[PDB]
Design a protein around this motif. Structure first.
Motif, short mmCIF file in Angstrom:
data_model
loop_
_atom_site.label_atom_id
_atom_site.label_comp_id
_atom_site.label_asym_id
_atom_site.label_seq_id
_atom_site.Cartn_x
_atom_site.Cartn_y
_atom_site.Cartn_z
N UNK A 1 38.25 46.15 30.86
CA UNK A 1 38.14 45.62 32.61
C UNK A 1 39.25 44.55 32.40
N UNK A 2 39.96 44.56 33.92
CA UNK A 2 40.56 43.51 33.71
C UNK A 2 39.94 42.13 34.29
N UNK A 3 38.85 42.16 35.82
CA UNK A 3 38.71 41.18 36.21
C UNK A 3 37.11 41.46 34.84
N UNK A 4 36.53 39.63 35.02
CA UNK A 4 35.06 39.03 34.95
C UNK A 4 34.65 39.45 35.31
N UNK A 5 35.07 40.60 36.28
CA UNK A 5 33.23 41.12 36.86
C UNK A 5 33.08 42.42 37.29
N UNK A 6 32.61 43.50 37.31
CA UNK A 6 32.77 44.95 37.62
C UNK A 6 32.87 45.37 38.81
N UNK A 7 33.07 44.47 39.59
CA UNK A 7 32.27 44.96 41.30
C UNK A 7 33.72 45.74 42.18
N UNK A 8 35.09 45.33 41.56
CA UNK A 8 36.30 46.05 42.12
C UNK A 8 36.45 47.19 41.60
N UNK A 9 35.96 47.57 40.02
CA UNK A 9 36.74 48.84 40.13
C UNK A 9 35.56 49.55 39.53
N UNK A 10 34.94 49.13 39.38
CA UNK A 10 33.25 50.25 39.09
C UNK A 10 32.38 50.56 39.90
N UNK B 1 42.52 55.80 38.24
CA UNK B 1 41.78 54.49 38.32
C UNK B 1 42.30 53.29 36.97
N UNK B 2 42.01 52.13 37.17
CA UNK B 2 42.46 51.71 35.38
C UNK B 2 41.62 52.02 35.12
#
Length: 234
Positions: free
Chosen positions: A48-57, A15-16
């Protein structure tokens, strides 16, 4: 002579943006670990890459809508690893590793202030620091000028999706160390021109041994990769 950058750690293998992934990048030969940052509701920096946590968490929502404690107590990375703060990463690795840190586009004065505050507190920038311990990158010229005004010795990398003399001339004007272009824009002609102007070229994001071989032939000074093991096969 060559800068091998672990893109969000060791993204091709785990995981990133986890401390386990950052350690795996170091174990697989990365010179730098690359950090992406987002500000929490309580003004703390999260990896965290994205502004939101939905993709990776295991959670949802904008990082800016939750406190650091709410995120770290309720959610994990999809593989079960903790979601680290910048403070978690700097406390864990200290001065033993080198950091390649992205600031937000568009320019966010609050992000840049919090980042420089934490780096200065660890002695990773300012008096007593090694010049290449921390490189800061941004798509936002304004962010890099803001940092250069405060800490003139931090090497700055200008991220770009286009590679022309206009971007190179801006690097020269504002005292940027490197141009960091999308690898599909890179030619030997453009690398040799950048070198003639005293600029370094760091390509992103280079994932196949064939792409790596091509860019080394063109003379790039470094690249960001998700697949650090492929560099050893060249």
């Amino acid at each position: 002579d060559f800068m091998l950058i672990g893109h969000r750690g060791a993204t091709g293998y785990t995981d990133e943006h986890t401390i386990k992934g950052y350690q795996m990048a170091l174990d697989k030969g990365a010179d730098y670990i690359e950090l992406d940052l987002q500000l929490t509701k309580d003004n703390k920096l999260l990896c965290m890459h994205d502004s939101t946590i939905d993709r990776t968490t295991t959670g949802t929502g904008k990082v800016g809508d939750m406190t650091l404690s709410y995120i770290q107590t309720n959610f994990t990375s999809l593989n079960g690893e903790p979601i680290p703060s910048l403070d978690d990463v700097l406390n864990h690795f200290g001065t033993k590793v080198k950091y390649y840190i992205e600031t937000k586009r568009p320019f966010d004065a609050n992000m840049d202030r919090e980042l420089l505050t934490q780096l200065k507190a660890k002695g990773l920038i300012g008096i007593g620091s090694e010049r290449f311990q921390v490189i800061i990158q941004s798509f936002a010229r304004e962010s890099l000028i803001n940092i250069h005004n405060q800490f003139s010795n931090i090497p700055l990398a200008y991220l770009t999706s286009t590679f022309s003399e206009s971007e190179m001339d801006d690097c020269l004007s504002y005292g940027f160390y490197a141009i960091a272009p999308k690898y599909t824009t890179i030619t030997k002609e453009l690398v040799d021109l950048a070198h003639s102007k005293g600029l370094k070229v760091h390509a992103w994001t280079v994932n196949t041994k064939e792409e790596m071989q091509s860019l080394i032939q063109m003379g790039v000074d470094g690249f960001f990769t998700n697949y650090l093991d492929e560099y050893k096969k060249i």
